[PDB]
Symmetry: D2
Subunit: 116 residues, 4 copies
């Protein structure tokens, strides 16, 4: 509920389906610890990554496996992945939607931040 | 010199070459008057569209023929074209670079306005 | 239902609320005729522009009044509007979502086309 | 010469000036080894990062310090930075231009790969 990932395909004009997403959180020792992972549905959305209880203050990295996505469609893309890094919940709990728009040599990422 | 157009291809990661661009100026009766046109170069850029003396304040439209570009590469596009509409404002010395990043079902346009 | 407009604000990371949207359709005489209009809700979405019956084959222009949006937030933007022009329903009826991401000197537009 | 970074500001419609950029190369043990760095120029560009002889095939990360850029302009940003990660592949003569278009809650990156 508090963290949602949405992925679109700018070549097909469709949701980007079956995109792997890995979420990390910066530990006290300054390393990235595994936080959550999943894959986008037929709507291009990934719900259920985390809960309000687990999604504490921190620096999060959302790694979107754009390379595996493009290669499964028989295409050779430029990027290894799309990485989104942000501080979460510094002024109290929020809801974060990370949107990504994918092309083989280009991506954009947008954060929609709402107060529940 | 005061108006430049740059077009990139997000699918091939390249300049968008030989893309037709038409510039219109809005006339007093609200119609679009042809003003300038050309084809992007091997660098995806279109220089020499106009001059300081000709590029007066007003509303301009830059139409980029994205549909023809995608058809020439064998790729199915969504838009008829990309239309960028803006007011040229004299407020001190200015150069307008209109940049467009093209995908079959998406484009982005950005104005880089420098002194 | 067949045509939906979604608008985001890249400065605030929020839906772009109260954005005026004018839809035109190219007439037989090659002029733009008024087709539909509305404004984005608190979610940044505009539903109810048209019906499956009215939304026939044609060339449509979706004009998003980005200038009025930015000026209402006391900001002077570059563009007059964001214009999206496309051929609709050439291979039969589809559902079109036109998404726009707005910044004062930049916008992006994405079409998501689905088969109902 | 073979790797160039260009950064634009979507809020002010300008080159993104004095933006710190760090380039890392992935080492055999999967860590990120410092490779190159600099500050974008008055044109939003960072030239001279590396040479043909030094820029071998491998996985590179380009980190753009977007958070510092927005703070210096008095604007509240979302991301800690913009990270662009890619494999450099020799397949014939190539120049990589990494372009980034920055907004407070959004960025776009594009690779322009030319001969
Ligand atoms: Ca878990
Ligand atoms: Ca001028
Ligand atoms: Ca002339
Ligand atoms: Ca009506
Ligand atoms: Ca090289
Ligand atoms: Ca060096």
């Amino acid at each position: 509920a508090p963290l949602v990932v949405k992925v679109l395909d700018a070549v097909r004009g469709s949701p980007a389906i079956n995109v792997a997403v890995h979420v990390f959180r910066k530990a006290a020792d300054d390393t990235w610890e595994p936080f959550a992972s999943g894959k986008t549905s037929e709507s291009g959305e990934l719900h259920g990554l985390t809960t309000e209880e687990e999604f504490v203050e921190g620096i999060y990295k959302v790694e979107i496996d754009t390379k595996s996505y493009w290669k499964a469609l028989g295409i050779s893309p430029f990027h290894e992945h799309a990485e989104v890094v942000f501080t979460a919940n510094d002024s109290g709990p929020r809801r974060y939607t990370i949107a990504a728009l994918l092309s083989p040599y280009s991506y954009s990422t947008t954060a929609v931040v709402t107060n529940p």
